[PDB]
Structures are given as structure tokens and as C-alpha cells.
mmCIF file of N, CA and C in Angstrom:
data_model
loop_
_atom_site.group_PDB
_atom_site.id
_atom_site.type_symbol
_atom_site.label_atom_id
_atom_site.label_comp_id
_atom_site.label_asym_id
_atom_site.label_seq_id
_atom_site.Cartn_x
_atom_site.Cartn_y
_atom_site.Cartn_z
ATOM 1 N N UNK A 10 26.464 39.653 -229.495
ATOM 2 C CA UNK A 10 26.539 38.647 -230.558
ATOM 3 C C UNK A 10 25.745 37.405 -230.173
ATOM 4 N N UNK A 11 25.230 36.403 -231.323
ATOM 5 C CA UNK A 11 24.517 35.188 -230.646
ATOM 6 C C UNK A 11 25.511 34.389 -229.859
ATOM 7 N N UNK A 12 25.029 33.996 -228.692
ATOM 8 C CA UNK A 12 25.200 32.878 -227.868
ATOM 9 C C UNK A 12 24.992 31.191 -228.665
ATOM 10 N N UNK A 13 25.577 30.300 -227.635
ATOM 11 C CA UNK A 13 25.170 28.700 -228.318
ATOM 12 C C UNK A 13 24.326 28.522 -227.762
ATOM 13 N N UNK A 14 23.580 27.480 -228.523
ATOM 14 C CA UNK A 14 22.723 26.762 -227.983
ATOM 15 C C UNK A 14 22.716 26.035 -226.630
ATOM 16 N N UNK A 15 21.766 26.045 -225.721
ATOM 17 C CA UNK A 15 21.573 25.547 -224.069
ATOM 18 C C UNK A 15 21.656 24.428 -224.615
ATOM 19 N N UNK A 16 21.527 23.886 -222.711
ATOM 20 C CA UNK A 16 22.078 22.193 -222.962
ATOM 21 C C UNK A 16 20.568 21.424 -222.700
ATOM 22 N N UNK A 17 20.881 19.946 -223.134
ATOM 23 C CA UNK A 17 20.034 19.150 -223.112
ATOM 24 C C UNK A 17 18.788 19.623 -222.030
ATOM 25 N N UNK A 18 17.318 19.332 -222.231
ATOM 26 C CA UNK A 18 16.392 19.186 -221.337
ATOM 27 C C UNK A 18 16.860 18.512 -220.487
ATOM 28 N N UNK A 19 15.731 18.700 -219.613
ATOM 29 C CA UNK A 19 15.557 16.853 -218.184
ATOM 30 C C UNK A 19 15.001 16.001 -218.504
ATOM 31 N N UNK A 20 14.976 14.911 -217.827
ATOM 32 C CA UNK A 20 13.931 13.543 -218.190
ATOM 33 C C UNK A 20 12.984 14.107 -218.179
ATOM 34 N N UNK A 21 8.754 12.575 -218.680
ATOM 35 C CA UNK A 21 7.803 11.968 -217.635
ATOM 36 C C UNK A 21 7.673 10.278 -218.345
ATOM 37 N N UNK A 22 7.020 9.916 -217.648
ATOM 38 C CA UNK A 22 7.186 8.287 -217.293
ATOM 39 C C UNK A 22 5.819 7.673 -218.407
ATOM 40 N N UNK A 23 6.276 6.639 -219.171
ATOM 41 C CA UNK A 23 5.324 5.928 -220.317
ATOM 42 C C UNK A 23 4.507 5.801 -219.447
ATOM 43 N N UNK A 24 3.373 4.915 -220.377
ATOM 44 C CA UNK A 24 2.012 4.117 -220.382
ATOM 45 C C UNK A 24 1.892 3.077 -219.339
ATOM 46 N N UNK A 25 1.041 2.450 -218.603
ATOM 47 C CA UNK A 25 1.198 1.535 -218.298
ATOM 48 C C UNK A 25 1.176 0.053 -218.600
ATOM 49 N N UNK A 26 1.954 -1.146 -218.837
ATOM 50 C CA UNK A 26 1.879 -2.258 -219.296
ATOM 51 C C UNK A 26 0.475 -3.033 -219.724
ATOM 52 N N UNK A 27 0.759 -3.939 -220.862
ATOM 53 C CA UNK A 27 -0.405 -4.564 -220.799
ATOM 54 C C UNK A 27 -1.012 -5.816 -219.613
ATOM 55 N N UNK A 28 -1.888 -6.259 -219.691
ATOM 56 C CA UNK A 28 -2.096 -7.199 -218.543
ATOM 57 C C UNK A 28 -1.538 -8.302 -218.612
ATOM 58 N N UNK A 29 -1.366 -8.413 -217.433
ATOM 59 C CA UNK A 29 -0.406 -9.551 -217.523
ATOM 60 C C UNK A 29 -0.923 -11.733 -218.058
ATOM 61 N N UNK A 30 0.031 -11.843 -217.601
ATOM 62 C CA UNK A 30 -0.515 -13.790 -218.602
ATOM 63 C C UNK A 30 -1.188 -13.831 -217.406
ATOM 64 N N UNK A 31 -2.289 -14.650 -218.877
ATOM 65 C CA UNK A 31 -3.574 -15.400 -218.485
ATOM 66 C C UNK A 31 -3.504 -16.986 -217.136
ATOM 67 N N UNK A 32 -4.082 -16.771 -216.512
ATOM 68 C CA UNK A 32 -4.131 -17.720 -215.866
ATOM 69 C C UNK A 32 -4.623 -18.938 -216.308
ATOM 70 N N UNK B 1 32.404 38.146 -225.300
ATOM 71 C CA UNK B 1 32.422 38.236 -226.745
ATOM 72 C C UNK B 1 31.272 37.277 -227.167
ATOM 73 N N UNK B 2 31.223 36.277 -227.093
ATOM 74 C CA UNK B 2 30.189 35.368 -227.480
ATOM 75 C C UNK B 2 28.660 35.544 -226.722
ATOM 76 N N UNK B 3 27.135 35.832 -226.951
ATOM 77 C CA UNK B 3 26.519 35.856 -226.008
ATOM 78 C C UNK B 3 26.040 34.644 -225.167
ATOM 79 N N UNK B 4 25.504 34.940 -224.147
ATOM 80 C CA UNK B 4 25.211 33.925 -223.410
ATOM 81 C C UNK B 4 24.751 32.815 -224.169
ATOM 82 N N UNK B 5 24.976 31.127 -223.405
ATOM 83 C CA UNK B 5 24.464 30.127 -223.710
ATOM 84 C C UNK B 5 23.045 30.358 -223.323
ATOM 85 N N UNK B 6 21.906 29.294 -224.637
ATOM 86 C CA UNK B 6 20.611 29.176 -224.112
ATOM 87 C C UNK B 6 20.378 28.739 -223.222
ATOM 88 N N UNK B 7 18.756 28.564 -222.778
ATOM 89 C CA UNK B 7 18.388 27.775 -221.595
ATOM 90 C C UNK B 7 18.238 26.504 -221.799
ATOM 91 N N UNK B 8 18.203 25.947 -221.056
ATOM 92 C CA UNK B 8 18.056 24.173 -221.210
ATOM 93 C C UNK B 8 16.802 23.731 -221.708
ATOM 94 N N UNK B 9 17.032 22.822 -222.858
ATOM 95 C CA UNK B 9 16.403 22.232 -223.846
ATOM 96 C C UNK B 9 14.804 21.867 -222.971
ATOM 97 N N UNK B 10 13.600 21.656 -223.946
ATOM 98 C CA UNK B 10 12.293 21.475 -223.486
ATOM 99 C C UNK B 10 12.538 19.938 -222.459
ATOM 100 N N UNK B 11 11.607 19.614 -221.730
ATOM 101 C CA UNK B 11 11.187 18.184 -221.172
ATOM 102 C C UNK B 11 11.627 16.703 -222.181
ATOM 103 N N UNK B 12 10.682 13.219 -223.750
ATOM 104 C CA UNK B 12 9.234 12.583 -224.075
ATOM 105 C C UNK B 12 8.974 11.324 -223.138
ATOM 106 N N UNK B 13 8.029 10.917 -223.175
ATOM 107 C CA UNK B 13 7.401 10.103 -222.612
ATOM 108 C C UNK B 13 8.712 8.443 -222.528
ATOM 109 N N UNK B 14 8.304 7.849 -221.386
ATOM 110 C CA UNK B 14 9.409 6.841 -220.845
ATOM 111 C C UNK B 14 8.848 5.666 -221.672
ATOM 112 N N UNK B 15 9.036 4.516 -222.409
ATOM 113 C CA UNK B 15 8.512 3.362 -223.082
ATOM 114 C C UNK B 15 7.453 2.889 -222.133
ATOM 115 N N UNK B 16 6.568 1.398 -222.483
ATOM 116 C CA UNK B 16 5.882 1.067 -221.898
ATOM 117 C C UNK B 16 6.035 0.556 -220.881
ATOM 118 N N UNK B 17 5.117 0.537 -219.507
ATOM 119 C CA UNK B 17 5.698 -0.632 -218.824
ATOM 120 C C UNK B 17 5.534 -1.754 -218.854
ATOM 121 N N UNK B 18 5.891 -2.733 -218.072
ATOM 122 C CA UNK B 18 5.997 -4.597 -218.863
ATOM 123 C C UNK B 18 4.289 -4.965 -217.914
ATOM 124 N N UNK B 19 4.386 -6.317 -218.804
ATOM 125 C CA UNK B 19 2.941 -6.925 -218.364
ATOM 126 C C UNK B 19 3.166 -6.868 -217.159
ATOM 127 N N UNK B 20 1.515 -6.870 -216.758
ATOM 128 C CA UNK B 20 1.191 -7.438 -215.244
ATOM 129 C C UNK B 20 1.563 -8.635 -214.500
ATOM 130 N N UNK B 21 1.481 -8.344 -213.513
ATOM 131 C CA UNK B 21 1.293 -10.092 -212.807
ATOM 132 C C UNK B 21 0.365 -11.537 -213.271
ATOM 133 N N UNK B 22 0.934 -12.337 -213.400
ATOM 134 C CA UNK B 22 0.249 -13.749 -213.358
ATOM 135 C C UNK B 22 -0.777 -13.567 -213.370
ATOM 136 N N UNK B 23 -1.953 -14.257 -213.925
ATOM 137 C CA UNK B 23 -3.254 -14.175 -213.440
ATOM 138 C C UNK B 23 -3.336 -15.549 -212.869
ATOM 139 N N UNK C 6 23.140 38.501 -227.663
ATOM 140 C CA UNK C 6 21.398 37.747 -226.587
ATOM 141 C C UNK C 6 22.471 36.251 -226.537
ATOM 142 N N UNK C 7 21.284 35.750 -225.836
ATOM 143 C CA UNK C 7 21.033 34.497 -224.999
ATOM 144 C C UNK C 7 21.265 33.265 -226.079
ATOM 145 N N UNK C 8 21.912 32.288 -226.310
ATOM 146 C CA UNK C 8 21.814 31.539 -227.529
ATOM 147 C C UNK C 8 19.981 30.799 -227.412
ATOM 148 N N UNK C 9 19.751 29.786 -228.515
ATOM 149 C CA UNK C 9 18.618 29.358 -228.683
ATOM 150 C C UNK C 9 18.447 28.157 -227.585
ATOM 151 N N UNK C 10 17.221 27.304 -227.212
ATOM 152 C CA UNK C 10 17.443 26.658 -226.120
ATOM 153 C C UNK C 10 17.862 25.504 -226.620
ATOM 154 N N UNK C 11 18.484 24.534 -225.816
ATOM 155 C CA UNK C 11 18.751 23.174 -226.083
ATOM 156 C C UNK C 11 17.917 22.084 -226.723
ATOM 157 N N UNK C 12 18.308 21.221 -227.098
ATOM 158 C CA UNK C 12 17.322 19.969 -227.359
ATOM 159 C C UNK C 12 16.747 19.447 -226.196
ATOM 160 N N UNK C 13 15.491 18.638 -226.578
ATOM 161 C CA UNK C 13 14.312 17.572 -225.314
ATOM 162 C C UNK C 13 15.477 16.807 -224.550
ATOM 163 N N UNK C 14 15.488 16.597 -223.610
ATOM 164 C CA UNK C 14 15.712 16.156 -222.500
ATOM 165 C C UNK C 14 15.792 14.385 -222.503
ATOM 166 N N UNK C 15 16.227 13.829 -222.017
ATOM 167 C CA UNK C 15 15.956 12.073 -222.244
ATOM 168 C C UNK C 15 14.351 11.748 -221.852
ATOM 169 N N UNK C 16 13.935 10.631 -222.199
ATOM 170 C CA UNK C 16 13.150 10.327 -222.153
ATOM 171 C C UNK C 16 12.922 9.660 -221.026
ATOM 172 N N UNK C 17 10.335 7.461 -217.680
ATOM 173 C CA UNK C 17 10.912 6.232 -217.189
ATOM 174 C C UNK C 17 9.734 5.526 -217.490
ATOM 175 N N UNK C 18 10.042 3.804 -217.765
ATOM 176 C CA UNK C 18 9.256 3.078 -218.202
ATOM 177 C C UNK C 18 7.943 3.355 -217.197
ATOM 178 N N UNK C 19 6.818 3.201 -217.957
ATOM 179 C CA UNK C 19 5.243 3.015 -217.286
ATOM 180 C C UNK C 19 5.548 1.804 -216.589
ATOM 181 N N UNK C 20 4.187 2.311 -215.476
ATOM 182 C CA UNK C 20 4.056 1.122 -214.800
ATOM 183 C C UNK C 20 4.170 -0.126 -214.984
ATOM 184 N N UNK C 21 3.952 -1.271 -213.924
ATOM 185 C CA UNK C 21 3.672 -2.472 -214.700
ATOM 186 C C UNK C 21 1.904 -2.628 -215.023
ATOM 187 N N UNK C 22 1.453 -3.152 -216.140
ATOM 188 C CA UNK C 22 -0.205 -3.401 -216.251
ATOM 189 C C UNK C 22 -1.026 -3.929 -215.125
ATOM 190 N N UNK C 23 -2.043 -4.059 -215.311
ATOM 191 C CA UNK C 23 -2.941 -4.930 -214.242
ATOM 192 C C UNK C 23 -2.548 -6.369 -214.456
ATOM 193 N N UNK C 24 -3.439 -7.342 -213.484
ATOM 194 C CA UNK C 24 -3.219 -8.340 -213.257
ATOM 195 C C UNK C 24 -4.071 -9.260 -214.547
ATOM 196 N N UNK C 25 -3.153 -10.182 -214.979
ATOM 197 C CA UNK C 25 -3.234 -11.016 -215.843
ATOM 198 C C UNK C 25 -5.374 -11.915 -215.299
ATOM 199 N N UNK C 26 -5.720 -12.067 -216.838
ATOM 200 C CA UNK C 26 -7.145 -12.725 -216.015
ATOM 201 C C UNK C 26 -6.818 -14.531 -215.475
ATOM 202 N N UNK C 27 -8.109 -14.437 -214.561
ATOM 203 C CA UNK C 27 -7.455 -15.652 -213.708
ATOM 204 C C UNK C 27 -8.519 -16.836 -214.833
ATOM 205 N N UNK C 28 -7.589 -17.929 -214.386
ATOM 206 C CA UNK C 28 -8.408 -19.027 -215.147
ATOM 207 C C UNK C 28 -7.990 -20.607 -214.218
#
């Protein structure tokens, strides 16, 4: 008979920031 | 009686990271 | 059978940006 649905995935890591304030 | 549970759900991407350092 | 697979997984912030321009 069908089974349930598996569990959640795992955590990859964003973008990197914009540059930072102007001097 | 019930069949097996699925496999664990696919892998999104982490938000941005924050500005840079001071200039 | 096997149930269907789970949902995506959680979603880590990007780096921090480069360095701010100097002035």
C-alpha cells in the first residue's frame, strides 16, 4: 500500500553582501 | 500495513549576506 | 512502495560583501 510522505530536506549558503559604506 | 515512509525531501539558497566593511 | 519524498529542506546567510570604497 502507499507509504507517507519523507521528512523535510537539509539546509546552501546566499549571495554575497553588497559593499560596504563609503568612506 | 502502511508502506514505507519517503526519502527525505530535496536540498534553497541562505538570504544575502550584510554589507562589507567600512571603507 | 515507498511513500513520495518530503518537502526542500530549510534554507545560511552569504558572505559579508567587499570592502566599502575609501574616500
Amino acid at each position: 500500500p502507499p507509504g507517507p510522505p519523507g521528512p523535510p530536506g537539509p539546509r546552501p549558503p546566499g549571495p554575497p553582501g553588497p559593499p560596504g559604506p563609503p568612506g
